[PDB]
Design a protein around this ligand. Structure first.
Ligand SMILES: CCCCOc1cc(C[C@@H]2CNC(=O)N2)ccc1OC
Ligand SMILES: CCCCOc1cc(C[C@@H]2CNC(=O)N2)ccc1OC
Ligand SMILES: [Mg+2]
Ligand SMILES: [Mg+2]
Ligand SMILES: [Zn+2]
Ligand SMILES: [Zn+2]
Lengths: 329, 329
């Protein structure tokens, strides 16, 4: 048996409540199982195994199969990105503006949704699967193709031998969870982003708070909408992390994009924007990504949970300043 | 070779442009192939084989497989209902208010959509497939489960040997058709009906007509919306047909509903509304169906194509009066 100083994985896992968790280091030290150990740590930390009577060996067995179904040959959409979205949602769930707001079931749904939200991603976009007449695009009628697929795989895996982590939820619990999880993952579809954000701004206009700053969320509609946006912000959280995490995420999305561009090229198709290795502006793309998508979203979020997300918003403008100012790589 | 007086099938098929076509008689006389002969007649009549260079043996082969994938053990959602929706859309396409309004591609899409809109229906509702945790509900995330499935089957069958009736459309034609067909079939989802109708009323408020009464439809949005509502009206056209057709449709939907109710019963589930053979009011249900769904829809349609649908609307109030007035069966 090892000493505290020796068990470097447990040591890193103590940072699970922090924005800026060294998730790549956790991936390396867990033997490429970041999703499994991070999910397990989060479930213990939130006392979710006890609350829903999830048997630990059932949780581990489900986590392993789910993690097995992220592709390790995909540079960005893989188990490490899933672990990062899970961990980022976990931190956002604990912002003071949201203190005691969500039930345990809603917390389960948000973390479970984050965990499966990209399962079995092939490293190519919805648009590429539509344009190449893939079996998934045919199956799903060109509409939210991957996000529909992530949901169906994440639920189906629950039926494997000893994988049903929801076996002791009541029928009604399982039905509400399912509903919430579907609503959250479908909302990760980037073609939904402009309306999601437009409607988030609208609900922030008429938000109600207790005198001590806690949000009041009285109904399903308002509750689910915060959770959809929360997970979406978690998904789009790379540029708000410490620069050295951020840069690694940027190298991985570019590598994945370039590989799609190469498939397009050998298939004789037009190369999609930002997917051409011979014609790339990595830094300018990040500045555009931040100016057009990431900052508008995080500014509205910070409004919703004011002043909780101020440091996140400062880091984001800093990283934007850095990508804007650097000498190209 | 037969005489005109002997070829009773060709004789019935001359009624293809009429509301009140004897579709059950066509089913019997075609050897249970109403969808095939009615689609073929409509394609010839509209000169669609020539316009899109569909080879006749390709059309027939696709029609036969598509018709084979409607279930003959299902009382209502079967090949005869598909043939009736196809034929009813065909007549609505020819209302004077819509004279020369739609391109040939849009006409193809509406008739093709009608033809596949219920393919492989199992005779049980979306809600039953969700409640029994079926593989389709899992696949499609509880959302438009059957309508997603109808689309995916109708497109997939095109890939069978000699079934590609769209082989000579340009890539861009095939892409617009696909888009239109998906938009039309997804709109047949009854959970979409209240919003479809609310939005149809809104567009009727600001509709524009030429001085001779032809609708002006300048953009995709307005065009697709009329086609969605057209096919939806065709789907919900049973109570607007001559009484003796109407009554046969009513016996078939009740029989299908009762069979679902029986599956629910033997599975020990609660029996869904109108699915309990031991507790049914066939006539009152039709009056409710007309008052709540069918008449509100057809009144708005008749507004849109005024005065074209007046006879349809008169027949509907007549049939409603009849079901209201009868001695229970
Ligand atoms: C390609 C450069 C511009 C965009 O950058 C990024 C884009 C994303 C969104 C991904 C890409 N596809 C998605 O559906 N979600 C995430 C991280 C990124 O960089 C760190
Ligand atoms: C069950 C009696 C009340 C409803 O009657 C009818 C309902 C329909 C709509 C069908 C039923 N399900 C659907 O998705 N579309 C069609 C014909 C009917 O009667 C002639
Ligand atoms: Mg995704
Ligand atoms: Mg249907
Ligand atoms: Zn993601
Ligand atoms: Zn139908």
């Amino acid at each position: 048996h090892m000493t505290e100083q020796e068990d470097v994985l447990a040591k890193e896992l103590e940072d699970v409540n922090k924005w800026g968790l060294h998730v790549f280091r956790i991936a390396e030290l867990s033997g490429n199982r970041p999703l499994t150990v991070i999910m397990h740590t989060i479930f213990q930390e939130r006392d979710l195994l006890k609350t829903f009577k999830i048997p630990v060996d059932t949780l581990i067995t489900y986590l392993m199969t789910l993690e097995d179904h992220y592709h390790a040959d995909v540079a960005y959409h893989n188990n490490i990105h899933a672990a990062d979205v899970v961990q980022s949602t976990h931190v956002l769930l604990s912002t003071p503006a949201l203190e005691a707001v969500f039930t345990d079931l809603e917390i389960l749904a948000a973390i479970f949704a984050s965990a499966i939200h990209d399962v079995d991603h092939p490293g190519v976009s919805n648009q590429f699967l539509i344009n190449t007449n893939s079996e998934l695009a045919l199956m799903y009628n060109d509409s939210s193709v991957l996000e529909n697929h992530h949901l169906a795989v994440g639920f189906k895996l629950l039926q494997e031998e000893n994988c049903d982590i929801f076996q002791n939820l009541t029928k009604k619990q399982r039905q509400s969870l399912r509903k919430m999880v579907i609503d959250i993952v479908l909302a990760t579809d980037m073609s939904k982003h402009m309306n999601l954000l437009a409607d988030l701004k609208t609900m922030v206009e008429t938000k109600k708070v207790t005198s001590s700053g806690v949000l009041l969320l009285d109904n399903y509609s308002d509750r689910i909408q915060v959770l959809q946006n929360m997970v979406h912000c978690a998904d789009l959280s790379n540029p708000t992390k410490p620069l050295q995490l951020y840069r690694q995420w940027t190298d991985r999305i570019m590598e994945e994009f370039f590989r799609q561009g190469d498939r397009e090229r050998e298939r004789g198709m037009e190369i999609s924007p930002m997917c051409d290795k011979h014609n790339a502006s990595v830094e300018k793309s990040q500045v555009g990504f931040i100016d057009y998508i990431v900052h508008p979203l995080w500014e509205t979020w910070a409004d919703l949970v004011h002043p909780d997300a101020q440091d996140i918003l400062d880091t984001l403008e800093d990283n934007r300043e850095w990508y804007q100012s650097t000498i190209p790589q």
